[PDB]
Design a protein around this ligand. Structure first.
Ligand SMILES: C[S@@+](CC[C@H](N)C(=O)[O-])C[C@H]1O[C@@H](n2cnc3c(N)ncnc32)[C@H](O)[C@@H]1O
Ligand SMILES: C[S@@+](CC[C@H](N)C(=O)[O-])C[C@H]1O[C@@H](n2cnc3c(N)ncnc32)[C@H](O)[C@@H]1O
Ligand SMILES: C[S@@+](CC[C@H](N)C(=O)[O-])C[C@H]1O[C@@H](n2cnc3c(N)ncnc32)[C@H](O)[C@@H]1O
Lengths: 98, 1024, 347, 50
């Protein structure tokens, strides 16, 4: 898994491309910068003060009337998972009874 | 040298002239926004092994492609892709021209961030209309984006005098990109987000901003001439996967790509062409508390600092980068090894040394410090990469004054050999068969049959069969029987009869053939029959009809040729039947079978005709039987020898059968048989000392091949051990031809040296006392890639030249003349002394040529003396002590150089040799011995002006006769014993040419003998 | 003449501006193969020599020559490109030799040796050497001159007397002249030193004929005139090359020579205004009667014309001549109703 | 027919003791030897990294 060369595409193309999807499309960490250390100086340690850590990306919104669109890393992740599972179910040798 | 992979020492360079920047205006944006066929804002990248477009590098107007690839939905093929881009950018062009009139907005600068974000939003259909008022800039580029009020966080957002902006997509991936080993690396610049570049105006405000901001992955600065103003770049935590053995993250890939690009730029600096930027290195600024020592980010920071200072890589980089090359470079940089350079990566500022050639301090106000403390001892020059060769090239050594012990070099070469391998053998002897003939004369001598020699008794032994089978397996021919038959017929149709005057054999002959064999990879007959019938030999007339008999016919009949059989009477009959098949491996039954074949071939001859008989094993009983029975019934005869394979078999040809006469054997036939048997003995003694056909070599053989293979990292002065090993190989080789090859083997730059040993080399190794050492400079300069080949034992496939063969003849004469434990002296060796491989080990030498030598001074067991004082002159030979003087292939050269006659040159030589203390002497003289045939293409004489005119060498020399030479010798000494040594018909000189692993010839050794008869060597003993 | 009277290199030779001028001229001068053109020139001027002893000439056919300083890569065969046409007689001012062997650091069909101190080889009747003092010399005139002396020693001892040799000299200094006058000229029948001129540098060739005969030869006033002409030629052409812009420059207007364009628009048939006439006349006063080319084309929905020409120091002198800026007759541009497609500008 | 129907093996690949289904080689000789060259090059990079 750490070395993508050791998965051969002839034997394991599905596992190789799922590994590539994990290596490239997994969500990135970000920060939000809460608080103030002027009064009640920050108790953050091993991090700088006035910062939080978030395991997913965060851009802030620009409007106050929210609607639906399709541009963020979580919907991208769901799209890639559904894309690999449709590449898996389209193959007939893996489910010959269907 | 090196840090962890070798960098190019002894030089460092950097570009000098930097281009002045150009503001990007609206007319330039329109001209880039439409795509001309001459220039367009995308350049295609292509695969190396297939020449297929697999990636696209992007440029200035389309660089805001930060969204996911699914949001755009490009087609996968490059032509459809670029057509789609041209159409959609033309739509965007019409939109922006509908917004802004060109005639009033021609000469105002446009905003780069808004331009890139506008292209990226229009390609993604993400409400680009609120960017159009921000396209024309005012009061600076950055403050409009700071103090703007349009809310769009997909591209930029302000934090108060610090603008952040998501850069993305320097490269673009196509569908056919498949992470192949020749695909170009993209350095993680094809993802959605690899970094977040934070722009501002002052680095103090940037450093105050990064107090509360994290610095986990580490930030990167640029400090030379940034893209759109002074800024930092913070990479995210995404990975690069298109490099197989190890995975690196984003800022690692950015620093690696810019370090390799600066390593590219340091080589191509020519001090007159300008570059767009003096250094592209990043020099990480805050993350060094998180990435520490021996990590890859730290080591690439070290290499980034070295690239900024202006070092060069020891091995050349390609024009287009490949994943294998990138993998090999990073695998070289993560290894063991200390930082040998004094340059250490700092944190406060990027430092440059005192004598670094970079001039980046003058074109930059903030960032660089000329540190006067540390210095770099290497000189300033560019890189000079020599052009590689596919074939291995010859090397010659040059020696030094230092010296070590012999056993140390023997131990080092035993460490460095790859000697247990199987070399390709080659071929001992190439060409057509040599022909040795003798015929009966009435007036020579009558001799008895018991006086003629026979086979040696040690003939069927294991070593003798080994030598004959080795020579027969290594000697390369076409058809043995065809070459033998052409030789015997061309020497058979030369005979004339004493009764009439014409000849014996004529056209329309009605011949018979005995001993026919079918398989010859052609027709099912011997291959001489149809060309001899069609007259293609052109030294023969064609016969009338050919019938073939023997055990293995295909178009004849099978009989037993011993006792008779129903057939006709044939006017000529040729026999090829041997005494090996029917004879049961003993000389008595073999001789009786010879007698029976002679009886049948005499009774089947149709009298008034001729026959040819082959004899494998000529013994005394065979000679006695043929002398008693055949010779009184034969008019005349001849016995000849075609020489293709080393054996004692001869041919017997008799002419004019069934007439009563009196014929015996002659002294010329006796001389021919002695020469034949001694030739067999010498060549068998040579063939029993060679290794086998398909051997592997272990080092114990007296002749063979040996190699070493030691490695050399980049440009480096090689150590003591490598020099000792190569010099020990040179002392083991002894001035044969030496070929080298430099090539990368399994991730290591290594060179090999391939040459051969000889018994003459072992004699030279026995000559010397201390092992001398070579000058390694001629190998240290080499920066090529010399691809090797598989080793062979006999390298010369075209054969030896007749000058070389003549030289080996004179060398055998010298080595036969010189005894053991005797002082000698030579006239005219050259830069190397070949006579050191000729004289024995205990015999001291003092040679002289007009040219300075290359053999080393000192380190010998016995006395050797080298001096250069024009030996033909006078006043030097008084102190010189010697017993025999040798002048080989140099007296005529000195006579031609002085432009004087050969008699006067020889007289001056004998006048200066009268003062010496020698008593025996042999020198090479230019004298016609036989009548002149003026050899075409190798020695064309001048009869009038008496010159030689060698066409292969372009030289000519005077000569005179042996009468005049003997006259001056007897005028010099009254008691001198003049003699003329004959040539070697018995090939006794071939020892030095075969044991030193050289395929000789056939035609060139014929030409070498016929050249030796026109310039022999005389020997003078002044006493007796 | 004495050897001390002959000139040498200027001391301001390895400076930044001098290297800039030489690298600019070498990057801009367009050729085929440098070594091929140099070798054709030196052989055509070498086979014209006649000897004073006999009457024919020095060099003839069937010569058995040697080659020093061989390089492999020339985008052709793996040898210098003069060898096989000179062997086949394609030059047609030369006779062909008998055999050519090639030595040097970068051979492909020869052997690698160090040409400074001797080495095992034969004796060649002619020998042409290029070994240069840049690679092995460590960027100083003392070691360069000593390496010249060592190459002269090796090339004299490897000459097979009664023959000739050709030596190149990159850096002809007083020590080199003194050494060759003391050692080589008493052992040489006659000589010539020539110069093929392809790249702006001070390197010359030395050709000597008839080695290893005792005679008395010195330098002459004609050689002195040739050396003065050579060094002053280098000085003038370097002074010219140090005033040009660089190879791939962008132009900002501060350069004394270069190119400049303007691009003003003209809607249909119209008498152009005062400002366009002033601008085009100012460009004409800045150009100063060089060739001027125009192009009329629609650019982004606007009919526009460009004017492309070049400036010179003579143009700056003419701009310094005059007092008031005169104005052109715009009629020859007002009549034009074509569509003249432009091209990219060249210098 | 002069058709490649079998392959004789030598010293480095002689430990092929498992069943043929466990390996899954392609049937044609050219694709087979190309697959072997690629996968042995991967093994070469692994052992040289060790
Ligand atoms: C003479 S060589 C072949 C030479 C071959 N025909 C050529 O000239 O190219 C060997 C042949 O001699 C034949 N042979 C040997 N002893 C014989 C015998 N006693 N009678 C007849 N044929 C014999 C064998 O049948 C064998 O084919
Ligand atoms: C072709 S070689 C012969 C030596 C060697 N066997 C060879 O074949 O190279 C000619 C040699 O004769 C020497 N020689 C010619 N004339 C000479 C002279 N007058 N005094 C001393 N040596 C001379 C030269 O030094 C040269 O090495
Ligand atoms: C003489 S110049 C260039 C010659 C030019 N390439 C030609 O083909 O005529 C430099 C070349 O000489 C070669 N060379 C051989 N021996 C040399 C030496 N002792 N000193 C300097 N260069 C030497 C180097 O390998 C280098 O490629």
């Amino acid at each position: 898994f750490m070395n993508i060369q050791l998965i051969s595409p002839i034997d394991a193309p599905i596992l190789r491309q799922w590994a590539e999807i994990i290596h490239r499309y997994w969500p990135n960490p970000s920060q939000i910068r809460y608080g103030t250390p002027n009064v009640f100086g920050s108790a953050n340690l091993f991090t700088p003060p006035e910062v939080l850590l978030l395991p997913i990306d965060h851009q802030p919104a620009n409007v106050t009337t929210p609607t639906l669109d399709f541009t963020n890393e979580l919907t991208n992740w769901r799209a890639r998972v559904c894309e690999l599972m449709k590449n898996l179910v389209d193959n007939q040798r893996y489910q010959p009874g269907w | 040298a090196n840090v962890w992979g070798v960098r190019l020492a002894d030089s460092l360079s950097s570009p000098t002239i930097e281009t002045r920047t150009r503001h990007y205006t609206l007319h330039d944006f329109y001209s880039d926004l439409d795509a001309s066929v001459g220039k367009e804002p995308w350049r295609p990248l292509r695969n190396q092994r297939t020449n297929e477009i697999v990636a696209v590098q992007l440029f200035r107007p389309l660089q805001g492609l930060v969204f996911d690839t699914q949001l755009y939905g490009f087609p996968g093929t490059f032509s459809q892709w670029e057509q789609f881009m041209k159409e959609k950018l033309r739509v965007l062009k019409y939109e922006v021209l509908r917004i802004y009139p060109i005639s009033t907005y021609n000469h105002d600068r446009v905003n780069v961030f808004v331009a890139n974000a506008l292209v990226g939003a229009f390609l993604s259909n993400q409400a680009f209309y609120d960017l159009l008022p921000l396209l024309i800039v005012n009061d600076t580029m950055i403050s409009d984006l700071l103090g703007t009020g349009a809310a769009l966080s997909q591209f930029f957002q302000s934090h108060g005098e610090v603008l952040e902006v998501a850069a993305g997509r320097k490269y673009l991936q196509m569908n056919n990109y498949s992470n192949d080993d020749d695909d170009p690396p993209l350095f993680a610049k094809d993802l959605s987000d690899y970094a977040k570049a934070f722009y501002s105006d002052t680095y103090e405000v940037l450093d105050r901003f990064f107090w509360t901001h994290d610095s986990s992955a580490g930030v990167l600065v640029h400090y030379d001439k940034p893209t759109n103003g002074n800024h930092y770049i913070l990479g995210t935590l995404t990975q690069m996967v298109s490099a197989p053995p190890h995975i690196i993250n984003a800022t690692d890939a950015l620093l690696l790509e810019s370090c390799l690009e600066q390593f590219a730029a340091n080589v191509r600096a020519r001090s007159a062409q300008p570059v767009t930027r003096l250094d592209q290195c990043y020099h990480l600024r805050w993350g060094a508390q998180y990435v520490g020592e021996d990590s890859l980010t730290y080591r690439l920071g070290v290499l980034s600092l070295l690239a900024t200072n202006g070092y060069q890589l020891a091995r050349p980089i390609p024009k287009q980068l490949t994943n294998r090359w990138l993998s090999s470079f990073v695998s070289q940089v993560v290894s063991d090894g200390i930082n040998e350079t004094p340059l250490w990566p700092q944190e406060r500022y990027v430092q440059i040394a005192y004598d670094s050639p970079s001039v980046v301090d003058g074109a930059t106000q903030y960032g660089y410090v000329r540190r006067n403390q540390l210095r770099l001892g290497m000189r300033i020059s560019a890189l000079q990469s020599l052009s590689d060769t596919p074939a291995p090239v010859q090397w010659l050594p040059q020696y030094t004054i230092d010296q070590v012990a012999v056993d140390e070099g023997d131990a080092m070469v035993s460490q460095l050999t790859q000697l247990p391998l199987r070399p390709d053998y080659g071929s001992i002897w190439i060409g057509e068969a040599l022909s040795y003939y003798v015929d009966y004369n009435r007036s020579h001598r009558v001799v008895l049959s018991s006086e003629l020699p026979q086979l040696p008794d040690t003939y069927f032994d294991g070593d003798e069969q080994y030598g004959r089978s080795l020579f027969s397996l290594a000697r390369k021919v076409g058809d043995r029987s065809l070459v033998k038959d052409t030789a015997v017929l061309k020497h058979a149709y030369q005979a004339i009869d004493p009764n009439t005057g014409k000849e014996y054999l004529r056209a329309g002959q009605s011949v018979a053939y005995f001993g026919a064999s079918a398989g010859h990879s052609g027709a099912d007959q011997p291959l001489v029959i149809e060309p001899w019938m069609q007259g293609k030999i052109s030294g023969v007339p064609p016969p009338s009809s050919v019938r073939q008999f023997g055990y293995d016919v295909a178009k004849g009949a099978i009989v037993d040729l011993a006792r008779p059989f129903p057939s006709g009477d044939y006017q000529f009959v040729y026999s090829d039947v041997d005494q090996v098949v029917d004879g049961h491996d003993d000389l008595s039954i073999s001789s009786g079978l010879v007698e029976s074949l002679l009886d049948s071939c005499v009774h089947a001859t149709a009298p008034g005709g001729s026959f040819v008989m082959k004899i494998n094993f000529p013994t005394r009983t065979v000679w006695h039987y043929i002398e008693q029975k055949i010779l009184p019934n034969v008019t005349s005869y001849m016995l000849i020898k075609p020489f293709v394979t080393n054996n004692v078999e001869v041919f017997f040809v008799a002419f004019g059968v069934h007439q009563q006469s009196a014929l015996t054997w002659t002294s010329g036939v006796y001389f021919f048989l002695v020469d034949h048997f001694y030739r067999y003995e010498t060549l068998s003694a040579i063939s029993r000392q060679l290794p086998s056909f398909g051997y592997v070599d272990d080092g114990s053989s007296v002749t063979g091949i040996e190699i070493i293979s030691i490695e050399n990292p980049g440009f480096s002065n090689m150590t003591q051990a490598a020099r000792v090993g190569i010099s020990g190989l040179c002392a083991n080789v002894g001035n044969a031809r030496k070929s080298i090859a430099i090539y990368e083997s399994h991730g290591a730059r290594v060179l090999t040296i391939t040459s051969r040993r000889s018994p003459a080399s072992a004699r030279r190794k026995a000559r010397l006392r201390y092992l001398p050492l070579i000058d390694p400079r001629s190998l240290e300069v080499q920066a090529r890639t010399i691809l090797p080949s598989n080793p062979v034992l006999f390298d010369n496939i075209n054969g030896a030249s007749p000058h070389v063969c003549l030289t080996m003849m004179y060398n055998f004469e010298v080595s036969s003349a010189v005894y053991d434990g005797d002082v000698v002296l030579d006239l005219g060796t050259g830069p190397e002394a070949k006579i050191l491989e000729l004289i024995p080990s205990t015999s001291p030498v003092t040679c002289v040529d007009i040219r300075p030598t290359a053999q080393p001074n000192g380190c010998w067991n016995v006395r050797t003396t080298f001096l250069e004082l024009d030996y033909l002159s006078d006043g030097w030979i008084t102190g010189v002590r010697g017993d025999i003087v040798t002048c080989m292939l140099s007296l005529g050269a000195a006579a031609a150089g002085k432009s004087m006659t050969f008699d006067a040159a020889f007289q001056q030589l004998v006048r200066v040799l009268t003062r010496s203390t020698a008593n025996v002497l042999l020198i090479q003289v230019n004298c016609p011995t036989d009548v002149i045939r003026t050899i075409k293409g190798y020695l064309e004489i001048d009869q009038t002006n008496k010159r030689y005119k060698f066409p292969k060498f372009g030289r000519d020399e005077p000569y005179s006769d042996m009468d005049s030479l003997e006259r001056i010798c007897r005028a010099a000494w009254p008691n001198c014993s003049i003699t003329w040594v004959p040539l070697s018909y018995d090939l006794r000189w071939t020892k030095l040419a075969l044991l030193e692993s050289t395929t000789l010839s056939s035609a060139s050794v014929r030409i070498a003998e016929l050249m030796y008869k026109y310039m022999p060597i005389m020997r003078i003993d002044i006493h007796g």
